[PDB]
Amino acid sequence: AVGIGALFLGFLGAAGSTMGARS
C-alpha cells in the first residue's frame, strides 16, 4: 500500500519535519 512507515515513523519520527502547531 501507501507510505505508513514512511510519513510518521520515517519522515516525522526518524528524521524531522514541521507538521503544525496548536496556536
User: Taking the C-alpha atoms of 9, 15, 17 and 22 in order, what is their torsion angle to the nearest 10 degrees?
Assistant: 60
Distance CA 14, CA 22 (A): 22
Distance CA 19, CA 8 (A): 10
Is residue 5 a contact partner of residue 13, using CB atoms and an 8 Å limit? no
Distance CA 19, CA 1 (A): 22
**Where is 8: in which H helix or E strand?**
none
**Residue corresponding to grid cell 507538521:** 19
Is residue 17 a contact partner of residue 11, using CB atoms and an 8 Å limit? yes
Distance CA 15, CA 11 (A): 5
From first CA to last CA, the distance across the chain in angstroms is 34
Nearest to 7 by CA among 22, 15, 20: 15
Nearest to 6 by CA among 19, 18, 14: 14
Give the three-state DSSP class for 18.
Answer: coil
